[PDB]
Design a protein around this ligand. Sequence first.
Ligand SMILES: CCCCCCCCCCCCCCCCCC(=O)OC[C@H](COP(=O)([O-])OCC(O)COP(=O)([O-])OC[C@@H](COC(=O)CCCCCCCCCCCCCCCCC)OC(=O)CCCCCCCCCCCCCCCCC)OC(=O)CCCCCCCCCCCCCCCCC
Ligand SMILES: CCCCCCCCCCCCCCCCCC(=O)OC[C@H](COP(=O)([O-])OCC(O)COP(=O)([O-])OC[C@@H](COC(=O)CCCCCCCCCCCCCCCCC)OC(=O)CCCCCCCCCCCCCCCCC)OC(=O)CCCCCCCCCCCCCCCCC
Ligand SMILES: CCCCCCCCCCCCCCCCCC(=O)OC[C@H](COP(=O)([O-])OCC(O)COP(=O)([O-])OC[C@@H](COC(=O)CCCCCCCCCCCCCCCCC)OC(=O)CCCCCCCCCCCCCCCCC)OC(=O)CCCCCCCCCCCCCCCCC
Ligand SMILES: CCCCCCCCCCCCCCCCCC(=O)OC[C@H](COP(=O)([O-])OCC(O)COP(=O)([O-])OC[C@@H](COC(=O)CCCCCCCCCCCCCCCCC)OC(=O)CCCCCCCCCCCCCCCCC)OC(=O)CCCCCCCCCCCCCCCCC
Ligand SMILES: CCCCCCCCCCCCCCCCCC(=O)OC[C@H](COP(=O)([O-])OCC(O)COP(=O)([O-])OC[C@@H](COC(=O)CCCCCCCCCCCCCCCCC)OC(=O)CCCCCCCCCCCCCCCCC)OC(=O)CCCCCCCCCCCCCCCCC
Ligand SMILES: CCCCCCCCCCCCCCCCCC(=O)OC[C@H](COP(=O)([O-])OCC(O)COP(=O)([O-])OC[C@@H](COC(=O)CCCCCCCCCCCCCCCCC)OC(=O)CCCCCCCCCCCCCCCCC)OC(=O)CCCCCCCCCCCCCCCCC
Ligand SMILES: CCCCCCCCCCCCO[C@@H]1O[C@H](CO)[C@@H](O[C@H]2O[C@H](CO)[C@@H](O)[C@H](O)[C@H]2O)[C@H](O)[C@H]1O
Lengths: 383, 85, 168, 80, 105, 231, 135, 139, 62
Amino acid sequence: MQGSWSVLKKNCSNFFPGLLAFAQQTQEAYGIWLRIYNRQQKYGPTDFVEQSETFSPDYHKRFHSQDKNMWVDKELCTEVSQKEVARLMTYKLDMWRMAHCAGALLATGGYAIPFGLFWLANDTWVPSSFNLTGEELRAWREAQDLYRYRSAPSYLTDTKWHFDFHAYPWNETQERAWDDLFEKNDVRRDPKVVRPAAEMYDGFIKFELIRRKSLRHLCRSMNIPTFPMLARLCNGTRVRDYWNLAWCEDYMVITQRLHESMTDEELYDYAWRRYLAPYDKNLNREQLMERVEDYFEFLGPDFVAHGKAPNLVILTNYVLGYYNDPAYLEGDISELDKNDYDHLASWGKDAFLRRLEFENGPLRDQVEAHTQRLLAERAAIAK
Amino acid sequence: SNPADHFRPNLKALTLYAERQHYVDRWLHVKERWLAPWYLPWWSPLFQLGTWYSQRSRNLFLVENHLSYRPYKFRRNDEDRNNPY
Amino acid sequence: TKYELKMQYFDEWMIRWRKFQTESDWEIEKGRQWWRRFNMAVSGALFCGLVLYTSGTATLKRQYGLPHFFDIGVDGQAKETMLKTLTSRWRYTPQGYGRVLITGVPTYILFVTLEHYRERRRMQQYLQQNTVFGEQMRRLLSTGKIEEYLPVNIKATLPASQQAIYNY
Amino acid sequence: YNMLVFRDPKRRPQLSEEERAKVVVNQAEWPEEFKDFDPDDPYKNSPEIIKGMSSWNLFLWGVECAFIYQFYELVFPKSI
Amino acid sequence: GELFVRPKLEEIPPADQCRGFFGPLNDSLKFLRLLDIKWMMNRAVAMRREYLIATPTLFTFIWMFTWKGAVIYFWGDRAPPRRMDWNTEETGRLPLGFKPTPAPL
Amino acid sequence: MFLFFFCDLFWLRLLLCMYYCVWSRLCFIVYFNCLMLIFDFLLFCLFDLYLFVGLCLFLLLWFMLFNLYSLILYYCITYLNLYLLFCIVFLLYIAFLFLFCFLCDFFLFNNLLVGDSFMDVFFIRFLLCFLECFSLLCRCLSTFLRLFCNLLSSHFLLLMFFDFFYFIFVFFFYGVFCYWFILFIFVFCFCLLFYVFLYLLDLFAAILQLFIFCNMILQLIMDFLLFLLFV
Amino acid sequence: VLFSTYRSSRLVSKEFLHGPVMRFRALGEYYFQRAWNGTLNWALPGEYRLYAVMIPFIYFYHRWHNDHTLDRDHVEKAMIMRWGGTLEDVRKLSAKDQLRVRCFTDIEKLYSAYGPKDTYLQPPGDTLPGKDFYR
Amino acid sequence: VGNGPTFSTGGECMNTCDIQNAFPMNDRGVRSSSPFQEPNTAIYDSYLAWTYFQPMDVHIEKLPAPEAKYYQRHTKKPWDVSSTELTEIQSRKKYFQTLGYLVAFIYLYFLMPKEKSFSGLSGPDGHWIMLPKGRPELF
Amino acid sequence: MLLGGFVPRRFSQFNRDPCWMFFIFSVGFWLGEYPAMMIKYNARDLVYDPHRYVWSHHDDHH
Ligand SMILES: CCCCCCCCCCCCCCCCCC(=O)OC[C@H](COP(=O)([O-])OCC(O)COP(=O)([O-])OC[C@@H](COC(=O)CCCCCCCCCCCCCCCCC)OC(=O)CCCCCCCCCCCCCCCCC)OC(=O)CCCCCCCCCCCCCCCCC
Ligand SMILES: CCCCCCCCCCCCCCCCCC(=O)OC[C@H](COP(=O)([O-])OCC(O)COP(=O)([O-])OC[C@@H](COC(=O)CCCCCCCCCCCCCCCCC)OC(=O)CCCCCCCCCCCCCCCCC)OC(=O)CCCCCCCCCCCCCCCCC
Ligand SMILES: CCCCCCCCCCCCCCCCCC(=O)OC[C@H](COP(=O)([O-])OCC(O)COP(=O)([O-])OC[C@@H](COC(=O)CCCCCCCCCCCCCCCCC)OC(=O)CCCCCCCCCCCCCCCCC)OC(=O)CCCCCCCCCCCCCCCCC
Ligand SMILES: CCCCCCCCCCCCCCCCCC(=O)OC[C@H](COP(=O)([O-])OCC(O)COP(=O)([O-])OC[C@@H](COC(=O)CCCCCCCCCCCCCCCCC)OC(=O)CCCCCCCCCCCCCCCCC)OC(=O)CCCCCCCCCCCCCCCCC
Ligand SMILES: CCCCCCCCCCCCCCCCCC(=O)OC[C@H](COP(=O)([O-])OCC(O)COP(=O)([O-])OC[C@@H](COC(=O)CCCCCCCCCCCCCCCCC)OC(=O)CCCCCCCCCCCCCCCCC)OC(=O)CCCCCCCCCCCCCCCCC
Ligand SMILES: CCCCCCCCCCCCCCCCCC(=O)OC[C@H](COP(=O)([O-])OCC(O)COP(=O)([O-])OC[C@@H](COC(=O)CCCCCCCCCCCCCCCCC)OC(=O)CCCCCCCCCCCCCCCCC)OC(=O)CCCCCCCCCCCCCCCCC
Ligand SMILES: CCCCCCCCCCCCO[C@@H]1O[C@H](CO)[C@@H](O[C@H]2O[C@H](CO)[C@@H](O)[C@H](O)[C@H]2O)[C@H](O)[C@H]1O
């Protein structure tokens, strides 16, 4: 979304109430995170707690391993509720953007004020706490959805093009899964059909091998600030933390069937945090439930059985495929009755163009026959 | 000689001259003007980026104790090898 | 207080008029260089300590575990001692932006603070000097402007073989 | 054919000999510009851009411009 | 060229097998391993840690090709002259009777 | 000292604006190998191995607009300076080298230590490593030197031959009306033949030199690329 | 909020200067947008007539610049140095004399390395002025 | 028929290109110069072969106009600029750039004098800038 | 790339295309400037500068 004066007024008016709300949310989220962190350190696997190192096979660069460096706490419901996890995720997003802004302020002193004016004029990078009414929150969510729409197609195209240019699927089922994974959101993708793409891509690029440019696209699509990007293991850490929390909440919901009892607005928020349900689509409860159930089915039985989710790259592509709208087409078909090169009509045809029309026109066969006969006669005379 | 003279830029328009002292001083004045305000604390990365490297280089110049002679950078004639002055 | 903005003009003038640099001023600058190196060393030590403290347990086990390059016996003993010391207690081991901040911000703050106060120390040292450079420093802090050609105005001392110019 | 390094493009035949032999040529339908069409000289009957302006006339125009360029200062010299 | 796989802990030969400039620096000579550069090179090759030999070299070259080369060329100290112009340490001091300005207070 | 001057491409910039306001397909590229680095399928690289395509294309266009059109008399190669070419090659080569070095993967340099464990490390392998590290920088220097020297020599030869042809054509054409006309006609025909040969040689050499210039940079990149196999 | 980062923020109407722009595009497209106009790296087109037109034009304007701006400096230097060492001394000559001097400079250029060397080397016994004539 | 251009080919022969399968083949065996179906495509042989398509008057059974619902997609975004609009913008920009470059070329090669002339009749000899002013203490 | 375009078969056809008309005009200039130089610089009344030995570029570049 572009900056506007109305949004600037909105954010300037709600600046200090927003900061106070952010501070209160910071205290609450620190409590929630402290509970989760203590539980992770106490009951987590040895590899997860010790932060086992996984290096790439080409340049031996460390990155998070989905199997070892991510852990789904199946018994987190005892200590932390689903709503608390959602609160922590939302606060993590807000805190990341606030932290980048605070870093800019500290770095540049008082010269960041005009950039702050640019910042408050847009809802893309302001915290959710700056909205004190429903309409303001709706506009803020619209800005977030617009940024997701702007960023997701590049991520999807990067993944698809690199794989298709450097590799191909092994079998027909993988071919169908790969082709159906990147369909536009106007058609419904069957998660059972699309799941094999996860293993196929695990053969190609696991989350531990994700490239820095692809990571930048993904973080843009997830509303995660990317400047300064720095090493890929910083925003990668952010992505890992966010999706680890999401998977913990998903296990809680699947096991306890909370989504069925979840209300309409809370269900919409739950889908939105999974990048499944844009607010501009005006989805009803039926559509939200369908998308959430498809997401759970994509996670698969192994997620509940062992807490192992499919490949994170393919999962992110699948969920962000809901922001891959059909390419726009505006204008009546009658516009195809016009002409594009009327401005050249005055120039006419030169000698070469006339020759080409004569040789390749409706009389082309006659000209070809005459030319070949003449050449044959000349060749015979020469011999 | 004459063939060698063909290999020169053909669209020279204007040449301007400025002493190193003068524009260095002007740049320092600009830097002081922009780094002076109170709302830019001395501990900010911007201020240190502006000042620390320059201070370090000037200190290195001052500490220099060379046994050889370095001819003045901006002499009128630096083409004579047997005349450093 | 921002001493660098005042001192840049003085340093440039000293470079331009370095002929009148007494051995005392040279010693002052050498001390400044030594203190800069010391500040770099201590800041680097702090950065290394913070990096080691925040390092992951598996990372430490790999780094301070077998094999031994030299295998003298002291090497293994030292590595085991450090590994046990680090892995005994609980350590906050952040990753990503967090480790960057924890390892860097203290280092930057320490280095900048030490350098700034050493710059103040050098300004005081030049204020206390009884040479033409010290007089220029005092005049700079008084009038706020650098007075070039000061050494030849107040007739600062010259070698016995170069006093003819002052002969007026 | 060629004019220095510029070679005249030639259309590749598309018909086979059997199909080609069955084609009936009727030059009455052809444009007047291309009658008795010759691949070795397709522009023999092509109209001139300017009526009465020959190629030799243009060549001579350039020669005269060169002579003017070299001889004008001989008749109307100017001071430094 | 091809992918590099680090050796396992069991695939690394013992330190006693490594050779120095003259011969192995075994017991009673272990502390000489620190000083023998060739022994360290052979040990690094044995442990597949060849980068310890290659990384310092290339970087050094880069450091010379990029930053120190020009510094030496433009600001280096040339060889001193035969007849040397030492400093008499007479310049700089204020003249007699001069009233220096007061220091800040 | 600040000299204000302009490049000799203003008419070509005008033509580019006129002829490329609308899109056109490009199917002929001087250095096509920057687009096809991998020839065996199922091989892929996690490094940004196609980052050089844009710079390669722009460099080819710029150097072609200068070098190829310099065959027209009085056309100036504005950048023809040894140290300026050094700056250009320094930018490209050192930028890619620093891209590989910022990766902080020291194992990438394992191949610098030439040979196998059988060869003596200090007296053979280490000296080969020294020579190879020297050879990287020498490759940079040779690239820029080759580009400079080829242009300089070609244009010197063209200028000298053109001067000779002008001299004989202007001051000895009267022999056509004399009894030694056959000698002048022989010399004139030889001069025409040498003229055509020199122009063709320069046209070929310019494109070949640009190809080699881009090939050196791509070789630097390829020396440090590692390819994974899809499974 | 002050300036848009998107090219879609239009500053003029779609029909602003439509006619002149269409004429300009017609001039550009007629010869260039053709199948046989396949360029080599955007620099060398396939159409012959583009060469036939642009090589002469480039040579013409470059030659005019060289003759009237670059070689004129050498010509004026020769005139000044050989006829007094000052501009006023040259201006004391008539236009015809200056024409003669400039054409002799052209002669020297055309010989260059192959002409006779008596154009600049004074043979012994020659009665013409030497280098110390004006000194 | 008109004199307008067609889908650009880049001077390539589609019967031997690396993406030849993307170009339909007609009855005569000549692959099209475009994604469209072409009945009269030909190949010309200069130093290199190149495919050419000659526009002609041909009637095609026109399926009736569909409803706007089944082909219009109203997913336009503020950042989106259509190809037609981009062509318009670039045409105007390049027109103005061409005029400016023309003026620059005329001035450079026909009006601008070269600096530092021997006679001093044309061009500047250079001068100093950034000289101090109102700083008596500087001297 | 030299792929195609109008190519006159002989001299007389250069007037069948405006671009080749300009080309043949330019060729006329190119080839006709040489005879003019022959006439001008091999003239009977052309006289070498009497002061040609006062100064030469050979002095200056040496
Ligand atoms: C005065 C001097 C200033 C120096 C100059 C500074 C120049 C600017 C540089 C930036 C400085 C920081 C700016 C503020 C950031 C906000 C605080 C913070 O860390 O937020 C958490 C957040 C953590 O991010 P993450 O990715 O989640 O971290 C992964 C970890 O695993 C996360 O760990 P976890 O997953 O286990 O979860 C823990 C989490 C759990 O907590 C929670 O969930 C609760 C929430 C806690 C965080 C709340 C943050 C709120 C941020 C907004 C604040 C309000 C702004 C209001 C603005 C308007 C004001 C009117 O709690 C944390 O986030 C803790 C993180 C670790 C602490 C980092 C702080 C270390 C530095 C401070 C100590 C310095 C002592 C000096 C001693 C001197 C000795 C000589 O920080 C960020 O978002 C990162 C900053 C983003 C900008 C980066 C810019 C480049 C930085 C380069 C620095 C290089 C070194 C310095 C030299 C530079 C020279 C060029
Ligand atoms: C009170 C408040 C509360 C307290 C404070 C709180 C903290 C606040 C601070 C933190 C806020 C963070 C969030 C900020 C968000 C907004 C950022 C932004 O700018 O958005 C674009 C923003 C609009 O954003 P938007 O409309 O919302 O669209 C956002 C979209 O999402 C589009 O988004 P997008 O992603 O597409 O846009 C991104 C775009 C952002 O960029 C832009 O959009 C560019 C903006 C500038 C465009 C200028 C165009 C106009 C130019 C005019 C030229 C002059 C004309 C003639 C004037 C004549 C005057 C007489 O690109 C980038 O991100 C590129 C980043 C580049 C980073 C560069 C890093 C360099 C590092 C150097 C190398 C170091 C290496 C290491 C070396 C180590 C050595 C040891 O742009 C503007 O509004 C343009 C303003 C133009 C102002 C006028 C022209 C300049 C005037 C200069 C005056 C100078 C006076 C002094 C002169 C003295 C002479 C001696
Ligand atoms: C046709 C002609 C037109 C005119 C042309 C003009 C001439 C241009 C010629 C040359 C242009 C190219 C130059 C390239 C240089 C090399 C760049 C390079 O090596 O980059 C490496 C690398 C590449 O960047 P990246 O992070 O990978 O991603 C860049 C993408 O663009 C990120 O994209 P993304 O999509 O991932 O993220 C989008 C979005 C994502 O949104 C977010 O992330 C949320 C918002 C983030 C807010 C910022 C947070 C910052 C946190 C702390 C950063 C570290 C501070 C370090 C300490 C301070 C040092 C000063 O981020 C933003 O929207 C960024 C907004 C930034 C707006 C400012 C852009 C510059 C406009 C000019 C303003 C300054 C004018 C000064 C001169 C005039 C003075 C009178 O850069 C970094 O690592 C970033 C380090 C940043 C350090 C701070 C800046 C250092 C430079 C000195 C600053 C001086 C300030 C002066 C203040 C006023 C004094 C009077
Ligand atoms: C990650 C990047 C990877 C990609 C790389 C890409 C590029 C290619 C690579 C190659 C580079 C290409 C070049 C590009 C241009 C870059 C700029 C450039 O070249 O500028 C040079 C440029 C050269 O200076 P210059 O401008 O030419 O002026 C010359 C003057 O000397 C200037 O004077 P100054 O006043 O500025 O002071 C400078 C001072 C700099 O040094 C200092 O200030 C003092 C020392 C600083 C230490 C820093 C911390 C180190 C760690 C501390 C301890 C940690 C452990 C703690 C726990 C211990 C527990 C036991 O150096 C000296 O003057 C020499 C003093 C040496 C004293 C030696 C006394 C004798 C005893 C010690 C040695 C012998 C020991 C024998 C033991 C035998 C045992 C059997 O700048 C400098 O080098 C000096 C300023 C910067 C200093 C930074 C200090 C940190 C360096 C990094 C250390 C850590 C990383 C390395 C190890 C990594 C291991 C994995
Ligand atoms: C205006 C301010 C200006 C600032 C200037 C200072 C520079 C910029 C400041 C910072 C800017 C912001 C961004 C920085 C880069 C961010 C990198 C990043 O994203 O890291 C993420 C990463 C977080 O990811 P993670 O998963 O938690 O951990 C990384 C993984 O392990 C990763 O796993 P992995 O698999 O990748 O493991 C590999 C990893 C393993 O390493 C690590 O990741 C561990 C952390 C680094 C350890 C480095 C120390 C190694 C030991 C040094 C021993 C030295 C002994 C010397 C003794 C001398 C005795 C005489 O990397 C390495 O192996 C690289 C080792 C370093 C090699 C250095 C080679 C240098 C060659 C020198 C050539 C010659 C130079 C010139 C000549 C000099 C002499 C004449 O962050 C870190 O690990 C630490 C980041 C620290 C950031 C820098 C803090 C800056 C503080 C500045 C203080 C001083 C200020 C001075 C101001 C002056 C006035 C203005
Ligand atoms: C004291 C005497 C004066 C001089 C003062 C100088 C002060 C210097 C300060 C100290 C600087 C130290 C460092 C110097 C380093 C120099 C290095 C260098 O030259 O490298 C070679 C290098 C050669 O580059 P290049 O390859 O030739 O390409 C650059 C070209 O500009 C072409 O590149 P491009 O085509 O890619 O450029 C983009 C181009 C894209 O194409 C275009 O836009 C086409 C137009 C091209 C224009 C630019 C080419 C200029 C051609 C020659 C001049 C044209 C005729 C001027 C007539 C003058 C008559 C006296 O767009 C533009 O140029 C944008 C500007 C368009 C302006 C349009 C104005 C329309 C006005 C309409 C008014 C209507 C009023 C109606 C009223 C009605 C009332 C009823 O130069 C540069 O890269 C640029 C160096 C500039 C350095 C900064 C200098 C400071 C700024 C000085 C401005 C002075 C303004 C005041 C003058 C007033 C008249 C006396
Ligand atoms: C957080 C750290 C805070 C540190 C606070 C201060 C700690 C106590 C003082 C430390 C010791 C200071 O003592 C320091 O000795 C060194 C010599 O070794 C002196 O240095 C002197 O001799 C060295 C000898 O090589 C010269 O290079 C140098 O130019 C000269 O100044 C310093 O001028 C003095 O400051």
